[PDB]
């Protein structure tokens, strides 16, 4: 009963759980430096995000090699994510970076690429070329995040529109356009997107954060865009409009993971509902056993202040209580004055929220959803977590090459760390976004084939010994595949750690 747990909570006692939630950091000027990345990792970064909304292919090649080198230095396996720009109408570049507009003024909105970089209070550029033929006089154009609105007065030229500004607002560079007329029919991946996706496979990113995912066929299209070279890489759908939520079930089925973009969600739907939508999406992902990430407005004030607000902190805590696997920093670590400190804050909030949750509630609720009979695969994973509770195991150790099994054990929300012994470095990196898991790499090329799994099993026990998780006398649960089958783990062992 969380109630019971709550009434026994004390803020004066030191916390004891091992951090289970995972932290994604976006990289920018404050952090692309190799030493900065080593600081971000020590502080608790697990995946490094590249915001492709901006930057040159040379720029991001730099982030990739820097995180690779920093991780190698610290002996870590860090996932790299490629967050697409996505097919979303944006505005362009302004003379001076800024321009302000007053209600009752008139502004020209052109799609002639010449004004693409010279944007002034009087006339500025938009990427969608047929915008003049789509929005008909009297129509409304929403800019920034629905903050600036325009009423189209006349279609003056072949490819510009004269509009009346209705509110007062100052815009800065490459902000977004929302046409509320519907009838926009945006692709799933822009031409720019397609070529960035190829760049990502060619450099070996671990996961794609696909933007503005609205239907299941869109995530299927994005999948198409990665050839066989990039089919083993995860697709995490960014849910950021009402269609994303409407079709969320289809989108979980077709994706590897979900990203809840709460800021973008707030543009169309009211805050009280974003709260509800977030619980809905997170919990549907929990039941699907797939990773889910909370993304916007995380600890944003700590981009320039050295402490966040209490409401921001409970916002993050609530995301964790909600069931989220991961939280993602944005400007806080990309262009922010306090990057290491914000990551560590997020670590402390993660741990506090773990220890305030009742250990067994999510397990029991997930288990009571599964109809009987269970698949053999799922029975093994669930029964292993419940064994862990019943013997009070200090760690679960699963041997998974693709990582299926580790995600399925994470689905059942155990009490202790999950250690994944894998022979694939790609799964070491990708497992950074599922809760409680920590990988250990086994180089088959360097060592044996470990047919009897004693060497890997040791590597894992050893690992948990050294990281303080388990000590001689404690009990561990070990899950793997038998020497009569391969493909999926179907076997479990209960071991007392010896020294």
């Amino acid at each position: 009963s969380q109630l019971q747990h709550n009434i026994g909570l004390s803020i004066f006692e030191p916390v004891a759980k091992h951090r289970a939630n995972r932290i994604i950091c976006t990289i920018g000027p404050s952090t692309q430096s190799v030493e900065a990345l080593k600081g971000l990792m020590k502080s608790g970064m697990s995946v490094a995000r590249m915001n492709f909304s901006h930057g040159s292919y040379e720029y991001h090649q730099t982030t990739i090699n820097n995180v690779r080198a920093a991780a190698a230095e610290l002996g870590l396996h860090i996932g790299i994510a490629l967050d697409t720009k996505g097919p979303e109408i944006r505005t362009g570049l302004f003379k001076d970076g800024e321009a302000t507009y007053a209600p009752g003024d008139t502004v020209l909105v052109t799609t002639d690429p010449a004004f693409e970089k010279i944007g002034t209070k009087e006339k500025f550029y938009v990427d969608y070329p047929q915008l003049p033929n789509v929005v008909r006089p009297g129509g409304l154009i929403y800019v920034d995040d629905g903050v600036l609105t325009l009423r189209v007065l006349s279609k003056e030229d072949d490819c510009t529109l004269k509009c009346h500004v209705n509110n007062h607002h100052r815009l800065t560079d490459r902000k977004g356009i929302n046409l509320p007329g519907c009838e926009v029919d945006l692709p799933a991946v822009s031409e720019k997107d397609r070529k960035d996706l190829q760049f990502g496979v060619e450099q070996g990113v671990d996961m794609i954060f696909a933007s503005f995912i609205r239907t299941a066929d869109q995530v299927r299209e994005v999948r198409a865009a990665l050839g066989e070279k990039g089919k083993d890489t995860l697709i995490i759908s960014k849910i950021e409009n009402h269609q994303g939520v409407q079709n969320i079930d289809a989108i979980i089925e077709a994706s590897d993971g979900i990203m809840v973009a709460r800021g973008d969600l707030g543009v169309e739907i009211p805050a009280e509902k974003v709260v509800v939508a977030q619980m809905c999406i997170i919990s549907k992902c929990n039941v699907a056993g797939k990773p889910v990430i909370c993304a916007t407005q995380m600890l944003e004030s700590m981009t320039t202040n050295p402490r966040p607000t209490r409401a921001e902190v409970t916002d993050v805590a609530n995301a964790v209580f909600n069931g989220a696997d991961c939280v993602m920093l944005s400007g806080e670590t990309a262009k922010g004055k306090y990057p290491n400190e914000v990551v560590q804050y997020m670590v402390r909030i993660c741990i506090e929220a773990q220890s305030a949750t009742h250990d067994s509630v999510m397990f029991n609720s997930i288990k009571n959803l599964q109809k009987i009979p269970m698949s053999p695969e799922e029975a093994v994973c669930s029964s292993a977590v419940s064994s862990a509770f019943e013997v009070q195991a200090k760690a679960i150790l699963v041997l998974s090459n693709t990582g299926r099994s580790a995600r399925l054990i994470s689905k059942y929300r155990p009490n202790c760390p999950i250690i994944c012994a894998t022979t694939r470095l790609l799964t070491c990196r990708q497992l950074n976004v599922t809760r409680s898991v920590e990988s250990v790499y086994y180089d088959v090329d360097a060592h044996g084939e470990d047919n009897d799994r004693e060497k890997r099993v040791q590597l894992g026990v050893d690992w948990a010994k050294t990281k303080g998780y388990v000590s001689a006398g404690d009990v561990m649960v070990i899950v793997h595949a038998d020497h009569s089958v391969k493909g999926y783990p179907n076997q479990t062992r209960l071991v007392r750690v010896r020294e």
């Binding site: 509320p180 007329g181 519907c182 009211p270």
Partner: protein, 131 residues
């Protein structure tokens, strides 16, 4: 609760154009809906027929939808600061002739179903003649 008042109906020639206006007043204090919190749908009922869905707009105007009969011809917009929702009708043709209602839902999102609406306006007559 909330009250709605339409205006702007009348006579027009085939191909003409109208602007319907719907003005709101009040609140469902029992819940805290003020039109600025409620989606608005437009319905029409032709003589002898039932209530047609025409179109809808989300609470803050960022989402609209229309029946195919009126897509590309009609435009729904709203100004919450004036508490008014508007429907623009262009290329009006004779079978659009009907009585027109605005209605308000106790949700941020609209429905196409008349029963999912909580408050209605009185309705205004639109008559489109040939030529």
């Amino acid at each position: 609760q909330v009250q709605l008042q339409e205006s702007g109906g009348g006579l027009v020639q085939s191909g003409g154009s109208l602007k319907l206006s719907c003005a709101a007043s009040g609140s469902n204090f029992s819940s805290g809906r003020t039109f600025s919190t409620d989606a608005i749908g437009w319905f029409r009922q032709a003589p002898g027929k039932e209530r047609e869905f025409v179109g809808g707009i989300s609470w803050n105007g960022g989402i609209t939808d229309y029946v195919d009969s009126v897509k590309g011809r009609f435009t729904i917009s709203r100004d919450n600061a004036k508490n008014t929702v508007y429907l623009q009708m262009n290329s009006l043709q004779p079978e659009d002739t009907a009585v027109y209602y605005c209605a308000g839902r106790d949700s941020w999102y609209f429905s196409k179903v008349p029963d999912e609406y909580r408050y209605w306006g009185q309705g205004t007559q639109v008559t489109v003649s040939s030529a």
